[PDB]
Amino acid sequence: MACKVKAELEAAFKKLDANGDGYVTALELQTFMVTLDAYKALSKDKVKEASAKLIKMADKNSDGKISKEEFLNANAELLCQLK
């Protein structure tokens, strides 16, 4: 009952830059967010063209980021497309 659902952002964040030293994390998400703070570059696939290279440094089978990241990273990505 305590609290609820929403802090899911704390997972990716706390995992994205909990210590940041040499592990692929949001450290790039910032660039992603800065490069497309509004995912205004997905659909076509201009998002993977940059993530694919960034994912090759940690994202090979789902290790880089798995949580709010996928939430926010998939939020617009999975939500992208429409009128």
PDB file of N, CA and C in Angstrom:
ATOM      1  N   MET A   1       0.840  -1.227   0.000  1.00  0.00           N
ATOM      2  CA  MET A   1       0.000   0.000   0.000  1.00  0.00           C
ATOM      3  C   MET A   1       0.862   1.259   0.000  1.00  0.00           C
ATOM      4  N   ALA A   2       1.947   1.226   0.767  1.00  0.00           N
ATOM      5  CA  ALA A   2       2.854   2.363   0.855  1.00  0.00           C
ATOM      6  C   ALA A   2       3.118   2.963  -0.521  1.00  0.00           C
ATOM      7  N   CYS A   3       3.345   4.272  -0.557  1.00  0.00           N
ATOM      8  CA  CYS A   3       3.612   4.967  -1.811  1.00  0.00           C
ATOM      9  C   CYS A   3       2.778   4.382  -2.946  1.00  0.00           C
ATOM     10  N   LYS A   4       3.301   4.469  -4.164  1.00  0.00           N
ATOM     11  CA  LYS A   4       2.604   3.947  -5.334  1.00  0.00           C
ATOM     12  C   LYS A   4       3.563   3.786  -6.510  1.00  0.00           C
ATOM     13  N   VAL A   5       3.025   3.876  -7.722  1.00  0.00           N
ATOM     14  CA  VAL A   5       3.831   3.739  -8.928  1.00  0.00           C
ATOM     15  C   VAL A   5       4.074   5.095  -9.583  1.00  0.00           C
ATOM     16  N   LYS A   6       5.322   5.346  -9.965  1.00  0.00           N
ATOM     17  CA  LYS A   6       5.688   6.605 -10.602  1.00  0.00           C
ATOM     18  C   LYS A   6       7.183   6.871 -10.462  1.00  0.00           C
ATOM     19  N   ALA A   7       7.751   6.453  -9.335  1.00  0.00           N
ATOM     20  CA  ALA A   7       9.171   6.644  -9.077  1.00  0.00           C
ATOM     21  C   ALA A   7      10.022   5.816 -10.033  1.00  0.00           C
ATOM     22  N   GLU A   8       9.361   5.106 -10.942  1.00  0.00           N
ATOM     23  CA  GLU A   8      10.059   4.274 -11.914  1.00  0.00           C
ATOM     24  C   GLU A   8      11.211   5.038 -12.555  1.00  0.00           C
ATOM     25  N   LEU A   9      11.137   6.362 -12.493  1.00  0.00           N
ATOM     26  CA  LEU A   9      12.170   7.215 -13.058  1.00  0.00           C
ATOM     27  C   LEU A   9      13.433   7.147 -12.215  1.00  0.00           C
ATOM     28  N   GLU A  10      13.249   6.854 -10.937  1.00  0.00           N
ATOM     29  CA  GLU A  10      14.357   6.760 -10.001  1.00  0.00           C
ATOM     30  C   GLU A  10      15.225   5.536 -10.283  1.00  0.00           C
ATOM     31  N   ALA A  11      14.649   4.551 -10.959  1.00  0.00           N
ATOM     32  CA  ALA A  11      15.367   3.326 -11.283  1.00  0.00           C
ATOM     33  C   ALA A  11      16.434   3.575 -12.334  1.00  0.00           C
ATOM     34  N   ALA A  12      16.011   4.134 -13.450  1.00  0.00           N
ATOM     35  CA  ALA A  12      16.915   4.435 -14.547  1.00  0.00           C
ATOM     36  C   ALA A  12      17.919   5.497 -14.145  1.00  0.00           C
ATOM     37  N   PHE A  13      17.437   6.501 -13.438  1.00  0.00           N
ATOM     38  CA  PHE A  13      18.291   7.582 -12.977  1.00  0.00           C
ATOM     39  C   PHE A  13      19.346   7.042 -12.021  1.00  0.00           C
ATOM     40  N   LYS A  14      18.873   6.364 -10.981  1.00  0.00           N
ATOM     41  CA  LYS A  14      19.751   5.782  -9.980  1.00  0.00           C
ATOM     42  C   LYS A  14      20.653   4.731 -10.611  1.00  0.00           C
ATOM     43  N   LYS A  15      20.235   4.217 -11.762  1.00  0.00           N
ATOM     44  CA  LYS A  15      21.013   3.212 -12.472  1.00  0.00           C
ATOM     45  C   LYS A  15      21.738   3.844 -13.650  1.00  0.00           C
ATOM     46  N   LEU A  16      21.214   4.972 -14.115  1.00  0.00           N
ATOM     47  CA  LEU A  16      21.812   5.685 -15.231  1.00  0.00           C
ATOM     48  C   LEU A  16      23.077   6.403 -14.781  1.00  0.00           C
ATOM     49  N   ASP A  17      22.997   7.107 -13.657  1.00  0.00           N
ATOM     50  CA  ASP A  17      24.165   7.810 -13.141  1.00  0.00           C
ATOM     51  C   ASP A  17      24.241   7.707 -11.625  1.00  0.00           C
ATOM     52  N   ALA A  18      24.189   6.481 -11.121  1.00  0.00           N
ATOM     53  CA  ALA A  18      24.272   6.248  -9.692  1.00  0.00           C
ATOM     54  C   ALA A  18      25.676   6.553  -9.203  1.00  0.00           C
ATOM     55  N   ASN A  19      26.645   6.341 -10.087  1.00  0.00           N
ATOM     56  CA  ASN A  19      28.037   6.598  -9.772  1.00  0.00           C
ATOM     57  C   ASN A  19      28.805   7.061 -11.005  1.00  0.00           C
ATOM     58  N   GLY A  20      28.298   6.707 -12.181  1.00  0.00           N
ATOM     59  CA  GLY A  20      28.948   7.099 -13.419  1.00  0.00           C
ATOM     60  C   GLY A  20      30.461   7.068 -13.320  1.00  0.00           C
ATOM     61  N   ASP A  21      31.076   6.101 -13.992  1.00  0.00           N
ATOM     62  CA  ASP A  21      32.522   5.966 -13.981  1.00  0.00           C
ATOM     63  C   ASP A  21      33.026   5.395 -15.301  1.00  0.00           C
ATOM     64  N   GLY A  22      32.352   4.359 -15.779  1.00  0.00           N
ATOM     65  CA  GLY A  22      32.735   3.730 -17.027  1.00  0.00           C
ATOM     66  C   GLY A  22      31.711   2.713 -17.478  1.00  0.00           C
ATOM     67  N   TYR A  23      30.442   3.012 -17.222  1.00  0.00           N
ATOM     68  CA  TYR A  23      29.356   2.116 -17.598  1.00  0.00           C
ATOM     69  C   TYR A  23      28.258   2.865 -18.346  1.00  0.00           C
ATOM     70  N   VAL A  24      28.082   2.506 -19.610  1.00  0.00           N
ATOM     71  CA  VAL A  24      27.080   3.120 -20.462  1.00  0.00           C
ATOM     72  C   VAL A  24      25.774   3.336 -19.716  1.00  0.00           C
ATOM     73  N   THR A  25      25.387   4.595 -19.605  1.00  0.00           N
ATOM     74  CA  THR A  25      24.159   4.967 -18.916  1.00  0.00           C
ATOM     75  C   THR A  25      23.564   6.244 -19.498  1.00  0.00           C
ATOM     76  N   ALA A  26      22.583   6.804 -18.795  1.00  0.00           N
ATOM     77  CA  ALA A  26      21.932   8.032 -19.237  1.00  0.00           C
ATOM     78  C   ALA A  26      22.969   9.079 -19.615  1.00  0.00           C
ATOM     79  N   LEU A  27      24.197   8.876 -19.143  1.00  0.00           N
ATOM     80  CA  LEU A  27      25.284   9.794 -19.441  1.00  0.00           C
ATOM     81  C   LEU A  27      25.216  10.201 -20.904  1.00  0.00           C
ATOM     82  N   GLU A  28      24.552   9.364 -21.692  1.00  0.00           N
ATOM     83  CA  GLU A  28      24.356   9.616 -23.104  1.00  0.00           C
ATOM     84  C   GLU A  28      22.910  10.028 -23.322  1.00  0.00           C
ATOM     85  N   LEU A  29      22.053   9.543 -22.427  1.00  0.00           N
ATOM     86  CA  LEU A  29      20.640   9.872 -22.475  1.00  0.00           C
ATOM     87  C   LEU A  29      20.498  11.379 -22.487  1.00  0.00           C
ATOM     88  N   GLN A  30      21.414  12.031 -21.785  1.00  0.00           N
ATOM     89  CA  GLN A  30      21.437  13.483 -21.728  1.00  0.00           C
ATOM     90  C   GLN A  30      21.670  14.026 -23.126  1.00  0.00           C
ATOM     91  N   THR A  31      22.568  13.364 -23.840  1.00  0.00           N
ATOM     92  CA  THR A  31      22.876  13.727 -25.206  1.00  0.00           C
ATOM     93  C   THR A  31      21.672  13.404 -26.061  1.00  0.00           C
ATOM     94  N   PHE A  32      21.051  12.282 -25.736  1.00  0.00           N
ATOM     95  CA  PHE A  32      19.854  11.856 -26.435  1.00  0.00           C
ATOM     96  C   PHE A  32      18.750  12.868 -26.188  1.00  0.00           C
ATOM     97  N   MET A  33      18.613  13.245 -24.926  1.00  0.00           N
ATOM     98  CA  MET A  33      17.620  14.222 -24.517  1.00  0.00           C
ATOM     99  C   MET A  33      17.971  15.587 -25.083  1.00  0.00           C
ATOM    100  N   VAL A  34      19.265  15.865 -25.153  1.00  0.00           N
ATOM    101  CA  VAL A  34      19.734  17.131 -25.701  1.00  0.00           C
ATOM    102  C   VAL A  34      19.677  17.088 -27.218  1.00  0.00           C
ATOM    103  N   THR A  35      19.927  15.905 -27.765  1.00  0.00           N
ATOM    104  CA  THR A  35      19.881  15.705 -29.203  1.00  0.00           C
ATOM    105  C   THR A  35      18.433  15.594 -29.663  1.00  0.00           C
ATOM    106  N   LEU A  36      17.569  15.174 -28.742  1.00  0.00           N
ATOM    107  CA  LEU A  36      16.150  15.028 -29.024  1.00  0.00           C
ATOM    108  C   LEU A  36      15.348  15.005 -27.729  1.00  0.00           C
ATOM    109  N   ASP A  37      15.415  16.104 -26.986  1.00  0.00           N
ATOM    110  CA  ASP A  37      14.704  16.220 -25.717  1.00  0.00           C
ATOM    111  C   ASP A  37      13.238  15.843 -25.875  1.00  0.00           C
ATOM    112  N   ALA A  38      12.743  15.929 -27.101  1.00  0.00           N
ATOM    113  CA  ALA A  38      11.354  15.596 -27.389  1.00  0.00           C
ATOM    114  C   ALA A  38      11.265  14.471 -28.412  1.00  0.00           C
ATOM    115  N   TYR A  39      12.285  13.620 -28.435  1.00  0.00           N
ATOM    116  CA  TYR A  39      12.322  12.502 -29.368  1.00  0.00           C
ATOM    117  C   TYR A  39      11.940  12.960 -30.770  1.00  0.00           C
ATOM    118  N   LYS A  40      12.018  14.267 -30.999  1.00  0.00           N
ATOM    119  CA  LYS A  40      11.678  14.838 -32.294  1.00  0.00           C
ATOM    120  C   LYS A  40      12.677  14.408 -33.365  1.00  0.00           C
ATOM    121  N   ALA A  41      13.042  13.128 -33.354  1.00  0.00           N
ATOM    122  CA  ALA A  41      13.991  12.602 -34.327  1.00  0.00           C
ATOM    123  C   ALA A  41      13.913  11.080 -34.425  1.00  0.00           C
ATOM    124  N   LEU A  42      12.824  10.504 -33.923  1.00  0.00           N
ATOM    125  CA  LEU A  42      12.643   9.061 -33.963  1.00  0.00           C
ATOM    126  C   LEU A  42      11.916   8.636 -35.238  1.00  0.00           C
ATOM    127  N   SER A  43      10.764   7.994 -35.073  1.00  0.00           N
ATOM    128  CA  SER A  43       9.975   7.538 -36.212  1.00  0.00           C
ATOM    129  C   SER A  43      10.862   6.923 -37.285  1.00  0.00           C
ATOM    130  N   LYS A  44      11.416   7.778 -38.128  1.00  0.00           N
ATOM    131  CA  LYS A  44      12.284   7.336 -39.214  1.00  0.00           C
ATOM    132  C   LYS A  44      13.309   6.325 -38.724  1.00  0.00           C
ATOM    133  N   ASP A  45      13.917   6.627 -37.588  1.00  0.00           N
ATOM    134  CA  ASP A  45      14.924   5.752 -36.988  1.00  0.00           C
ATOM    135  C   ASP A  45      16.232   6.495 -36.750  1.00  0.00           C
ATOM    136  N   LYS A  46      16.150   7.815 -36.698  1.00  0.00           N
ATOM    137  CA  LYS A  46      17.326   8.645 -36.470  1.00  0.00           C
ATOM    138  C   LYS A  46      17.762   8.564 -35.014  1.00  0.00           C
ATOM    139  N   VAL A  47      17.012   7.803 -34.226  1.00  0.00           N
ATOM    140  CA  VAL A  47      17.316   7.636 -32.813  1.00  0.00           C
ATOM    141  C   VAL A  47      18.228   6.435 -32.587  1.00  0.00           C
ATOM    142  N   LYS A  48      18.006   5.376 -33.358  1.00  0.00           N
ATOM    143  CA  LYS A  48      18.804   4.162 -33.242  1.00  0.00           C
ATOM    144  C   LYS A  48      20.154   4.325 -33.927  1.00  0.00           C
ATOM    145  N   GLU A  49      20.188   5.161 -34.954  1.00  0.00           N
ATOM    146  CA  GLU A  49      21.419   5.409 -35.694  1.00  0.00           C
ATOM    147  C   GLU A  49      22.508   5.919 -34.760  1.00  0.00           C
ATOM    148  N   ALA A  50      22.087   6.489 -33.638  1.00  0.00           N
ATOM    149  CA  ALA A  50      23.020   7.018 -32.653  1.00  0.00           C
ATOM    150  C   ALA A  50      23.094   6.110 -31.435  1.00  0.00           C
ATOM    151  N   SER A  51      21.968   5.497 -31.108  1.00  0.00           N
ATOM    152  CA  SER A  51      21.888   4.596 -29.969  1.00  0.00           C
ATOM    153  C   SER A  51      22.526   3.254 -30.298  1.00  0.00           C
ATOM    154  N   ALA A  52      22.390   2.844 -31.550  1.00  0.00           N
ATOM    155  CA  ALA A  52      22.953   1.580 -32.005  1.00  0.00           C
ATOM    156  C   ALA A  52      24.448   1.536 -31.750  1.00  0.00           C
ATOM    157  N   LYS A  53      25.091   2.673 -31.944  1.00  0.00           N
ATOM    158  CA  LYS A  53      26.521   2.790 -31.725  1.00  0.00           C
ATOM    159  C   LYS A  53      26.811   2.905 -30.238  1.00  0.00           C
ATOM    160  N   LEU A  54      25.899   3.557 -29.534  1.00  0.00           N
ATOM    161  CA  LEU A  54      26.023   3.747 -28.100  1.00  0.00           C
ATOM    162  C   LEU A  54      25.637   2.477 -27.358  1.00  0.00           C
ATOM    163  N   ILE A  55      24.737   1.711 -27.958  1.00  0.00           N
ATOM    164  CA  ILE A  55      24.271   0.466 -27.362  1.00  0.00           C
ATOM    165  C   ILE A  55      25.295  -0.648 -27.536  1.00  0.00           C
ATOM    166  N   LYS A  56      26.171  -0.487 -28.518  1.00  0.00           N
ATOM    167  CA  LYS A  56      27.200  -1.476 -28.794  1.00  0.00           C
ATOM    168  C   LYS A  56      28.267  -1.467 -27.704  1.00  0.00           C
ATOM    169  N   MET A  57      28.219  -0.450 -26.850  1.00  0.00           N
ATOM    170  CA  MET A  57      29.179  -0.315 -25.768  1.00  0.00           C
ATOM    171  C   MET A  57      28.624  -0.884 -24.466  1.00  0.00           C
ATOM    172  N   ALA A  58      27.370  -1.324 -24.502  1.00  0.00           N
ATOM    173  CA  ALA A  58      26.729  -1.887 -23.318  1.00  0.00           C
ATOM    174  C   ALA A  58      25.411  -2.576 -23.661  1.00  0.00           C
ATOM    175  N   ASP A  59      24.745  -2.099 -24.709  1.00  0.00           N
ATOM    176  CA  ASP A  59      23.474  -2.669 -25.126  1.00  0.00           C
ATOM    177  C   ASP A  59      23.668  -3.720 -26.215  1.00  0.00           C
ATOM    178  N   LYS A  60      23.771  -4.980 -25.806  1.00  0.00           N
ATOM    179  CA  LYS A  60      23.951  -6.079 -26.749  1.00  0.00           C
ATOM    180  C   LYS A  60      22.832  -7.104 -26.599  1.00  0.00           C
ATOM    181  N   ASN A  61      22.283  -7.199 -25.393  1.00  0.00           N
ATOM    182  CA  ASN A  61      21.203  -8.139 -25.117  1.00  0.00           C
ATOM    183  C   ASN A  61      20.301  -7.619 -24.003  1.00  0.00           C
ATOM    184  N   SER A  62      20.437  -6.336 -23.688  1.00  0.00           N
ATOM    185  CA  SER A  62      19.634  -5.717 -22.642  1.00  0.00           C
ATOM    186  C   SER A  62      20.411  -5.638 -21.334  1.00  0.00           C
ATOM    187  N   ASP A  63      21.407  -4.758 -21.295  1.00  0.00           N
ATOM    188  CA  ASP A  63      22.225  -4.584 -20.109  1.00  0.00           C
ATOM    189  C   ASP A  63      22.480  -3.105 -19.830  1.00  0.00           C
ATOM    190  N   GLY A  64      22.634  -2.325 -20.894  1.00  0.00           N
ATOM    191  CA  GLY A  64      22.882  -0.903 -20.740  1.00  0.00           C
ATOM    192  C   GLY A  64      21.919  -0.248 -19.770  1.00  0.00           C
ATOM    193  N   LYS A  65      20.666  -0.108 -20.187  1.00  0.00           N
ATOM    194  CA  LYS A  65      19.643   0.506 -19.348  1.00  0.00           C
ATOM    195  C   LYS A  65      18.338  -0.282 -19.421  1.00  0.00           C
ATOM    196  N   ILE A  66      17.825  -0.684 -18.260  1.00  0.00           N
ATOM    197  CA  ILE A  66      16.584  -1.449 -18.197  1.00  0.00           C
ATOM    198  C   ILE A  66      15.690  -0.964 -17.060  1.00  0.00           C
ATOM    199  N   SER A  67      14.828   0.003 -17.364  1.00  0.00           N
ATOM    200  CA  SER A  67      13.911   0.558 -16.372  1.00  0.00           C
ATOM    201  C   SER A  67      13.337   1.884 -16.856  1.00  0.00           C
ATOM    202  N   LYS A  68      13.141   2.819 -15.931  1.00  0.00           N
ATOM    203  CA  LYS A  68      12.611   4.120 -16.299  1.00  0.00           C
ATOM    204  C   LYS A  68      13.210   4.537 -17.625  1.00  0.00           C
ATOM    205  N   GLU A  69      14.471   4.179 -17.805  1.00  0.00           N
ATOM    206  CA  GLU A  69      15.177   4.485 -19.039  1.00  0.00           C
ATOM    207  C   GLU A  69      14.380   3.961 -20.213  1.00  0.00           C
ATOM    208  N   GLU A  70      14.054   2.688 -20.147  1.00  0.00           N
ATOM    209  CA  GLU A  70      13.257   2.064 -21.182  1.00  0.00           C
ATOM    210  C   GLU A  70      11.886   2.710 -21.186  1.00  0.00           C
ATOM    211  N   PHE A  71      11.497   3.198 -20.013  1.00  0.00           N
ATOM    212  CA  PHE A  71      10.225   3.872 -19.845  1.00  0.00           C
ATOM    213  C   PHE A  71      10.230   5.173 -20.618  1.00  0.00           C
ATOM    214  N   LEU A  72      11.214   6.001 -20.312  1.00  0.00           N
ATOM    215  CA  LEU A  72      11.373   7.287 -20.974  1.00  0.00           C
ATOM    216  C   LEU A  72      12.000   7.096 -22.350  1.00  0.00           C
ATOM    217  N   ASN A  73      12.874   6.102 -22.457  1.00  0.00           N
ATOM    218  CA  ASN A  73      13.535   5.802 -23.717  1.00  0.00           C
ATOM    219  C   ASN A  73      12.560   5.129 -24.671  1.00  0.00           C
ATOM    220  N   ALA A  74      11.611   4.401 -24.101  1.00  0.00           N
ATOM    221  CA  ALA A  74      10.593   3.717 -24.884  1.00  0.00           C
ATOM    222  C   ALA A  74       9.285   4.494 -24.835  1.00  0.00           C
ATOM    223  N   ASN A  75       9.174   5.374 -23.842  1.00  0.00           N
ATOM    224  CA  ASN A  75       7.982   6.196 -23.678  1.00  0.00           C
ATOM    225  C   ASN A  75       7.609   6.864 -24.991  1.00  0.00           C
ATOM    226  N   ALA A  76       8.505   7.706 -25.472  1.00  0.00           N
ATOM    227  CA  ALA A  76       8.301   8.415 -26.727  1.00  0.00           C
ATOM    228  C   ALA A  76       8.572   7.497 -27.905  1.00  0.00           C
ATOM    229  N   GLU A  77       9.578   6.652 -27.744  1.00  0.00           N
ATOM    230  CA  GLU A  77       9.955   5.704 -28.780  1.00  0.00           C
ATOM    231  C   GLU A  77       8.801   4.754 -29.071  1.00  0.00           C
ATOM    232  N   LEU A  78       8.216   4.208 -28.011  1.00  0.00           N
ATOM    233  CA  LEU A  78       7.094   3.290 -28.147  1.00  0.00           C
ATOM    234  C   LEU A  78       5.799   4.062 -28.371  1.00  0.00           C
ATOM    235  N   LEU A  79       5.794   5.322 -27.952  1.00  0.00           N
ATOM    236  CA  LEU A  79       4.626   6.174 -28.103  1.00  0.00           C
ATOM    237  C   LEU A  79       4.687   6.955 -29.410  1.00  0.00           C
ATOM    238  N   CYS A  80       5.899   7.154 -29.913  1.00  0.00           N
ATOM    239  CA  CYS A  80       6.101   7.887 -31.157  1.00  0.00           C
ATOM    240  C   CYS A  80       5.244   7.306 -32.278  1.00  0.00           C
ATOM    241  N   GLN A  81       4.959   8.127 -33.283  1.00  0.00           N
ATOM    242  CA  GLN A  81       4.149   7.696 -34.417  1.00  0.00           C
ATOM    243  C   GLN A  81       2.674   8.008 -34.184  1.00  0.00           C
ATOM    244  N   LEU A  82       2.078   8.748 -35.113  1.00  0.00           N
ATOM    245  CA  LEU A  82       0.672   9.117 -35.010  1.00  0.00           C
ATOM    246  C   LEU A  82       0.418  10.480 -35.645  1.00  0.00           C
ATOM    247  N   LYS A  83      -0.774  11.022 -35.417  1.00  0.00           N
ATOM    248  CA  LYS A  83      -1.141  12.322 -35.967  1.00  0.00           C
ATOM    249  C   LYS A  83      -1.281  13.361 -34.860  1.00  0.00           C
TER     250      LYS A  83
END
